[PDB]
């Protein structure tokens, strides 16, 4: 909302950038369309964003689609084993710690390839992540940490930083 007609605000996966689309003219532009309620869009995107940026920690389990990370090329633990481990992991969380920061915990234990980037998945929109993951990420506020989220890849804990 805030947008005239028939404009829509969208997210460019290729550019990691918000843009504006006219479906009648098939025109796309980065700049806001003439006619817009400026701050009705801003606190529409603030409260209902079209892009978010997240960190996550992935612990895979036996019934995961891809039970083979850089840590083990065959993963044997249960779902509750992975969960209580992730729970214990999250209990260390400390933004001021060099070894217990979310980034560090990701680097220490996360089975996702993003472990080497501090669990940084970068910006993403609604056509990209697993539905279970997305529905938790977009419900989070900036700076907020999620509870345990189950997906096909494994279990996650998510931090939204953007």
Author numbering: 9 to 170
What does the paper say about this structure?
Saccharoymces cerevisiae Ess1 (Essential in yeast 1) is the founding member of the eukaryotic parvulin-class of peptidyl prolyl cis–trans isomerase (prolyl isomerase; PPIase). Ess1 and Pin1 are small modular proteins (~19.5 kDa) composed of two compact domains; an N-terminal Type-IV WW domain22 and C-terminal catalytic (PPIase) domain. Ess1 isomerizes the CTD of Rpb1, facilitating the recruitment of proteins needed for efficient transcription and RNA processing. Ess1 has a rigid linker between its WW and catalytic domains that enforces a distance constraint for bivalent interaction with the ends of long CTD substrates (≥4–5 heptad repeats).
